[PDB]
């Protein structure tokens, strides 16, 4: 009464144009109602007749109806199983080379459903050469079509390094960036930013996205009302920012990031801090710009607000470290940290339950802050010296014993470096000396690491300008290691070594 399936299957399996043509229309109509659709599926003979004729037909009207049938079947989880087993995936991929627009939509949407809720559909699309076809079709201009196409690429690229490389080889990066700076349809931009996000953790795709103009193209959508689009852009930008220290025209992006620091959302702030840290690292220009738009003030605020969330402070402290040295306004930034009540919270971050990455970052910042004479006293009063010395004592004793992320040598250099700058102040020199550090500093002259030698000879040089300290350095037998260091290939090491041997007369 309601199931005349075997009759229609035989009619689709005919060596005639108009017979196959007319039957495909009537089958397409049965899939439109959510009751007779269950009859088309669960019948393997019927679904195979469709897959065959769709891949074989030469009429325009027939290719649309057959493809729409599978599209209608793919909405139900038991339809996807029929299309997969019927061998529809290899046919639909060949159908991506179709000249007519309307059919492509049906083909791509069906493959999209298969990729989402059918086991093994990802593999089968890859092997049928679906990737190359999907990338090459990124030059189309229908926004709904492109949204499904980019999502297909995201599903196929996610957690699959081989696919990311093929997308790269087929000029994927450039095409996806182009979408970001042209189209403004939210759903397309979202799925497109999700593809780029997946691609951005690939070490070969990453530079390609950067070189195509990805950083800026992603920066365009950060003030956009859509939150899921903004977040995905941020995530991608973070992955990319370590390979972006050369890119120019960054002013707009840098300004927007400083503003995004004031956001209520942790994910937004975390990313903003991270991207800034990476872009301010060793790039002279970005350091200047970020300071000009109130980067210090926003970052201190960020750290103060963040508390003990190390995901926020670690990149924010790193950015602060970058901004407090080696640019025209570095002194200004050093003062600004103090003037925005940042010094106490900075010193606090040297104490537990802080982990090693944050401590390394915090130490390097204090080193920079201590370059400004007006920071000498407050850093002393907050207790930076005794804590730095404790990190130094413990890290050194870990080097002798024959842990997480960073090596203790980096901590040894960091603290001694920090103390070398602090020892510029006479009152700091007293505190440093009173903590029995002279013995440790002398032993540090024996270090194979030249950077440790330099900061060790540096702090000792600073301390040796006082008579009482000079005697202690001599008493610890520093003469022998210092005279060795007079001949170092490192001029800094040799200069300080001379200055200490000078003062011990």
């Amino acid at each position: 009464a309601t199931r005349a399936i075997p009759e229609l299957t035989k009619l689709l399996n005919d060596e005639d144009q108009v017979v196959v043509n007319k039957a495909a229309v009537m089958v397409h109509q049965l899939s439109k109602k959510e009751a007779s659709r269950h009859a088309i599926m669960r019948s393997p003979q019927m679904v195979s007749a469709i897959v065959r004729t769709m891949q074989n037909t030469n009429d325009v009207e027939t290719a649309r109806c057959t493809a729409g049938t599978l599209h209608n079947l793919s909405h139900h989880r038991e339809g996807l199983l029929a299309i997969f087993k019927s061998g529809g995936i290899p046919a639909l991929v060949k159908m991506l080379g179709s000249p007519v627009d309307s059919v492509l939509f049906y083909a791509i949407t069906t493959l999209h459903n298969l990729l989402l809720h059918q086991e093994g559909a990802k593999m089968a699309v890859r092997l049928a050469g679906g990737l190359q076809k999907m990338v090459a079709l990124l030059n189309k201009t229908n926004v709904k079509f492109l949204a499904i196409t980019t999502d297909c690429l995201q599903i196929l690229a996610y957690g699959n390094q081989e696919s990311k490389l093929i997308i790269l080889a087929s000029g994927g990066p450039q095409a996806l960036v182009n979408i970001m700076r042209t189209y403004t349809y939210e759903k397309l931009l979202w799925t497109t930013s999700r593809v780029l996000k997946v691609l951005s953790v690939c070490s070969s795709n990453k530079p390609a996205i950067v070189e195509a103009g990805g950083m800026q193209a992603l920066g365009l959508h950060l003030t956009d009302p859509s939150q899921r689009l903004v977040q995905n852009c941020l995530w991608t930008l973070r992955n990319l920012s370590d390979a972006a220290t050369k890119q120019e025209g960054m002013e707009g992006l840098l300004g927007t990031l400083v503003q995004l620091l004031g956001s209520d959302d942790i994910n937004v702030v975390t990313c903003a801090a991270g991207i800034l840290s990476n872009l301010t690292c060793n790039n002279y220009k970005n350091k200047m710009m970020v300071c000009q738009v109130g980067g210090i003030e926003a970052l201190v605020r960020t750290v103060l607000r963040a508390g003990d969330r190390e995901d926020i402070t670690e990149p924010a402290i790193c950015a602060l470290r970058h901004l407090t040295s080696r640019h025209q306004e570095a002194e200004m930034a050093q003062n600004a940290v103090r003037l925005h009540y940042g010094l106490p919270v900075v010193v606090k971050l040297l104490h537990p339950p802080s982990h090693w990455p944050l401590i390394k970052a915090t130490v390097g910042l204090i080193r920079n802050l201590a370059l400004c004479p007006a920071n000498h006293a407050p850093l002393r009063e907050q207790g930076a010296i005794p804590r730095l010395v404790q990190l130094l004592v413990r890290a050194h004793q870990d080097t002798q014993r024959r842990v997480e992320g960073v090596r203790m040598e980096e901590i040894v250099e960091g603290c001694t470096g920090a103390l070398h700058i602090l020892a510029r102040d006479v009152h700091n020199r007293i505190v440093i000396r009173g903590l029995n550090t002279i013995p440790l500093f002398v032993q540090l002259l024996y270090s194979p690491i030249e950077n440790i030698q330099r900061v060790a000879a540096g702090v000792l040089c600073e301390l040796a300008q006082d008579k009482e300290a000079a005697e202690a350095i001599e008493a610890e037998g520093a003469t022998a290691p210092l005279t060795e260091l007079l001949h170092s290939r490192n001029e800094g090491v040799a200069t300080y070594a001379a200055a200490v041997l000078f003062r011990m007369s």
Binding site: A1, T2, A4, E7, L11, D16, V18, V19, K22, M26
Partner: peptide, 24 residues
């Protein structure tokens, strides 16, 4: 196209319209 093929065509087109009366 042939004598018998055109008979096959029209008898196949009639079957489509016969099932259309069955459902609706």
């Amino acid at each position: 196209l042939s004598q018998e093929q055109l008979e096959h065509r029209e008898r196949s087109l009639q079957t489509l319209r016969d099932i259309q009366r069955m459902l609706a």
